[PDB]
Amino acid sequence: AMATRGANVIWFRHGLRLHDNPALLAALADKDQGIALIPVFIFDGESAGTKNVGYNRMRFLLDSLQDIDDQLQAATDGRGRLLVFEGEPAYIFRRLHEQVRLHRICIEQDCEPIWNERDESIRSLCRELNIDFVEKVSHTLWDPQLVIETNGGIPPLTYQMFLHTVQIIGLPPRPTADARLEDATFVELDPEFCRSLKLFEQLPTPEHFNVYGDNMGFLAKINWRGGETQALLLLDERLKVEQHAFERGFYLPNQALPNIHDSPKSMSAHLRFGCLSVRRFYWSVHDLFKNVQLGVQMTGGAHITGQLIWREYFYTMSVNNPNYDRMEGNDICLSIPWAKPNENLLQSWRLGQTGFPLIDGAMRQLLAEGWLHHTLRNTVATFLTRGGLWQSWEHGLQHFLKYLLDADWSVCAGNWMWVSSSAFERLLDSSLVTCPVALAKRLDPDGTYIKQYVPELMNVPKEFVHEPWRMSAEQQEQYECLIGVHYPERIIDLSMAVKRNMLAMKSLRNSLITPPPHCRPSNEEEVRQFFWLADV
Amino acid sequence: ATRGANVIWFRHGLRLHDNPALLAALADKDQGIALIPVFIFDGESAGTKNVGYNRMRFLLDSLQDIDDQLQAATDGRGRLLVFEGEPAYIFRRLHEQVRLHRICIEQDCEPIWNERDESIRSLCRELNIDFVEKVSHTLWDPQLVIETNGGIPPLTYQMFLHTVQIIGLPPRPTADARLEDATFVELDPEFCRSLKLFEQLPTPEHFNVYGDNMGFLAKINWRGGETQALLLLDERLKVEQHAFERGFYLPNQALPNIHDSPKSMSAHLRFGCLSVRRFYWSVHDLFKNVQLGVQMTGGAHITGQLIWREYFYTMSVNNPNYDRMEGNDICLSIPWAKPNENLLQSWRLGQTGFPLIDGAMRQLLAEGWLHHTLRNTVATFLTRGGLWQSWEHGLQHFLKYLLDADWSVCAGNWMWVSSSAFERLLDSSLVTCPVALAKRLDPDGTYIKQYVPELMNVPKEFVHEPWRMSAEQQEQYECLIGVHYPERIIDLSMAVKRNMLAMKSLRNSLITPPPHCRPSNEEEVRQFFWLADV
Ligand SMILES: Cc1cc2nc3c(=O)[nH]c(=O)nc-3n(C[C@H](O)[C@H](O)[C@H](O)COP(=O)(O)OP(=O)(O)OC[C@H]3O[C@@H](n4cnc5c(N)ncnc54)[C@H](O)[C@@H]3O)c2cc1C
Ligand SMILES: Cc1cc2nc3c(=O)[nH]c(=O)nc-3n(C[C@H](O)[C@H](O)[C@H](O)COP(=O)(O)OP(=O)(O)OC[C@H]3O[C@@H](n4cnc5c(N)ncnc54)[C@H](O)[C@@H]3O)c2cc1C
Ligand SMILES: [N+]
Ligand SMILES: [N+]
Ligand code: NA
């Protein structure tokens, strides 16, 4: 009877939330005619970033599915559930269509080109089966196609060009209303069909996908809880923080040092899985201040609002570029003659065995927890590339894409290229941006951060903790820390590396004479904010 | 002959643009009511009581500007009439010659102008003259702001913003005045003589003001008047545009430039050569159509600067004692040292032996304008950060030699800077150190060698701390301390200890801080002083 009436699918990939979910609303729009809802997620070997993934992000993802499932049950008195499958989407959806007739398959759009093949196969399937393929934009602030269209059919390569494009377009859509689940119908599937199509009964663990709690030697430290429920708690906290900050005259972040000793309050992973709607984030910041805004005069939330648009910028840049995550064949990235892969240096970098305390601390925190402050992401990225080992950013990106809790394909690639390959931004070759030691004394004066993530430095006194090599032979003995034994010797000479790298970047500028269009800082001031530079 | 005429009486508001009083005066043109443009040197109007050569010249420049514009727009028919004498007496005598239907003025909100204005109000009642007053010297009607804040002025800049956020945007500038078809009066030549109507604009010397500023030849770098004001606004708008395009918003991003071109409109704003509403709205309209929600846009800081001016003007409105410590409820009573006339005079003359202080005080005498950071420096040095003398001596000297010198803005800043005992950041010799400050503000001593000529030959390594030259170096560079350049008049190290202690005692004797004019928070201090995040 109900199986004859039919159903709509809301297919989660990203967009892992019930709030501001226009695809979900569309799936629910046929309630009146008794048409059921089938909420589903499919472990694909790909979807939601599961191809190149580590334990920390796997756990975060599983947390977010568990959250959706929980909310589903709670609001339907147990009738509704998240159906989690493992297998190929086209195969799964064709079989499900047989069991109960699918009126619509509804998705939140995934604008990155690495999702095009997956989605075309479902679009193609929907044609053959006469299913309505409903695709709604809500992972990004605006319809990236609209932005690209308004910018002459190509993507803005510069943050400021990006703002100039959306200023023409106007404010982004507000979040949609909440979904009404109380009166939804859900399907009972045949238990033998469920066995056959690999419908999980309990949500799988990371180990089931052959992903274990060991990140290159480090015991995974789980400081975040994935999911829409947490995402909304974190939003509240951040809105309060913004309010206090404004009240106390703090506008731009340059008015306070980056704080790397901070609690795990970041919503970056939540934004990447859509546990938090970026439109809800944008608009609740806007509504919090706009009332108290007086003309063109500074109001609250200005910077945080711009942060969201940085996300928008990189996502949008990627849309029509399958080569976004590499240098060769990528026409928005400069061709820079990086050194040949040196696996020894690459592993040392990956492991936090470089011999520069701050780099090592950042990399080890990365492996353990899967999240770094923007400023530490700059520092290890700069060190790996232009300001250091002169290794291609592509090695850095593949490492980040695995061990970060966020690791948005487009955003991670974008920041990597922006930082490493903007040859014509000469500030970026300066040592105030390069020097990991001076930056350590600024970010971590007392060695608190360094001693935490580089525990062999624990007894080295504050005087030497940033520069353990300056200890004498005797001192290294006294503090149980021998350079080349207990803690690695610096794997490269930074001063000569910087001299060599500048020359090479200047030589590259000379051969182009004129800068081709590439992903780059809008201007020098933008670089200064972006690296949180100390006036100087 | 009972035709009638309206007076537009300039005191401040020295401009034809955005002049609702002028517009009101012109509004009867169709009934053939003439216009009589009037300025009166009455001993005090437009800050002419305690005035030096430089500002008198700026003022005369602005009067000349109005007169030239009046002539150019009427083929010589319209003239600015400038009298010397007492306003009530002058308007009474004028009214006998030609019936006055209205006397129109831009409001002067400072209490120091209440006696003058009430005397004309009273005269208008008696003579059946309509006394018309318009708000256009300030952004909002200061009375409204005060009513909105519980009947008392906001003592804090943030409290002030909070108060105007409730009221909404300030009025836009008015349309331009249409003078071409206007009528003017020809008075009786004898009446003109007996009433001391000038034929040519007076010079400062007519008022016993001479081009010598405490031994300093007056250097006129500024041109008074609306015409010049409108040009400077255009230049400034282009600056804001380029500043926004290159990413600069808060300007903790750029060092203060103390040796910049004479581009400030501070004096023009004080005299009303430039409408503050035109400034506000020109900035706003430049960026609002490219602002997206709550995101940063252009002109944020400059707009705020206009608000600081509003903040201080408003605060003074109902406080005749704004310019002094005793009897002044919004100023903490601080036990300043009794006057030391030698030290005060050394401060005025730039004979303190600290190059930056001396440089700034001499620039002040010669040119009558200083960068905000230099005003801060010489102000904390006189009081609190140095000599421990009352800000009152600082104010009276500023009110004389500055090109701007708004009674309320000047007093308000002097108090904010000198007497905010509870902002401990202001205690730190690190924001009171003129040597460290000079090395940051003027690394090559370019500014110092200009206004302190005797240091001209001192190498860069020594120009900020000349006393560090050996006997031989002092001789070689023609700068003997105590001889060519005075010895430091005070030991700052010991002074800072002494001063911090006194301020601490003050804070400790008041268990709870009374309401007083003060910074809103530490971050505000940081921007106000242009501090290096250190
Ligand atoms: C080498 C490198 C790789 C990076 N990879 C990622 C990534 O995979 N995913 C990711 O979200 N960010 C990435 N970033 C940018 C940035 O460091 C993180 O977004 C930031 O650290 C998140 O912390 P937060 O939530 O407290 O940021 P906030 O300053 O509080 O900003 C809030 C949100 O705005 C967005 N945002 C902030 N900065 C950027 C930025 N530079 N580019 C794009 N969006 C931004 C993020 O969604 C962030 O969560 C990378 C930066 C570098 C240098
Ligand atoms: C002891 C002391 C006395 C002062 N006396 C005066 C004075 O008599 N008249 C005066 O206009 N300013 C005064 N100021 C404030 C300030 O230094 C000047 O307004 C500024 O130097 C003018 O330069 P600018 O036009 O380039 O400023 P901008 O930064 O370009 O600001 C533009 C306008 O905003 C207003 N503004 C800026 N800062 C302030 C401020 N702190 N308080 C009130 N308004 C401000 C002024 O009208 C100024 O012209 C004083 C400051 C101190 C510390
Ligand atoms: N969204
Ligand atoms: N003169
Ligand atoms: Na993110």
From Swiss-Prot, chain B:
Alphabetical GO biological process terms: blue light signaling pathway; cellular response to light stimulus; circadian behavior; circadian regulation of gene expression; circadian rhythm; detection of light stimulus involved in magnetoreception; entrainment of circadian clock; entrainment of circadian clock by photoperiod
- Give the principal location in a single coarse category: cytoplasm
**Which SUPFAM superfamilies does the entry link to?**
Cryptochrome/photolyase FAD-binding domain, Cryptochrome/photolyase, N-terminal domain
The disruption phenotype is: Flies exhibit poor synchronization to light-dark cycles and show no response to brief light pulses. Mutant abolishes rhythmic tim and per expression in photoreceptor and glial cells, but not within certain pacemaker neurons of adult brain.
**Where's it found, cell-wise?**
Cytoplasm; Cytoplasm, Perinuclear region; Nucleus
GO CC annotation: what is one?
Answer: cytoplasm
Show the GO MF annotations. blue light photoreceptor activity; DNA binding; FAD binding; flavin adenine dinucleotide binding; photoreceptor activity
Q: Return the cofactor note field.
A: Binds 1 FAD per subunit. The bound form of FAD in the inactive state of cry is oxidized FAD, not reduced. After activation by blue light the FAD is in an anionic radical state, which would be paramagnetic. Green light, which reduces levels of radical intermediate, has an antagonistic effect on function.
Regarding tissue, the record states: Expressed at higher levels in the head than in body and it is more expressed in antennae than in legs, wings and mouth appendages. Prominent expression is seen in cells of the lateral brain, which are close to or coincident with the clock neurons. Abundance oscillates in a circadian manner.
Nucleotide-binding as a keyword of this entry, yes or no, is yes
Q: What induces it?
A: Expression is regulated by light and circadian rhythms. Under circadian regulation, expression is influenced by the clock pacemaker genes period, timeless, Clock and cycle.
List, for all copies, the residue spans of the domain called Photolyase/cryptochrome alpha/beta: 4-139
> Needs which cofactor?
FAD
Positions that bind FAD: R236, S264, S266, Q305, H372, D404, A405, D406, C410, N413
Q: Which domain of life is it from?
A: Eukaryota
Q: What is the effect of changing W414A?
A: Abolishes formation of the FAD radical
**Which Gene3D superfamilies does the UniProt entry name for this protein?**
1.25.40.80, DNA Cyclobutane Dipyrimidine Photolyase, subunit A, domain 3, HUPs
The impact of changing D404N is: In cryb: Loss of accumulation. In photoreceptors, leads to an equivalent distribution of per in the nuclei in both day and night ultimately resulting in a slight decrease in Bdbt foci development
Tell me what else is known.
Answer: Unstable upon light exposure. Light induces the degradation of cry, likely due to conformational change in the photoreceptor leading to targeting to the proteasome. Appears to bind 5,10-methenyltetrahydrofolate at substoichiometric levels.
Describe its function. Blue light-dependent regulator that is the input of the circadian feedback loop. Has no photolyase activity for cyclobutane pyrimidine dimers or 6-4 photoproducts. Regulation of expression by light suggests a role in photoreception for locomotor activity rhythms. Functions, together with per, as a transcriptional repressor required for the oscillation of peripheral circadian clocks and for the correct specification of clock cells. Genes directly activated by the transcription factors Clock (Clk) and cycle (cyc) are repressed by cry.
Subunit structure, per the record?
A: Interacts with tim and per; promoted by light conditions. Interaction with tim irreversibly commits tim to proteasomal degradation. Interacts with l(1)G0136/CG8198.
Free-text comment about domains: FAD-binding region regulates cry stability, cry-tim interaction, and circadian photosensitivity. Photolyase/cryptochrome alpha/beta domain is sufficient for light detection and phototransduction.
Q: What is this protein called?
A: Cryptochrome-1
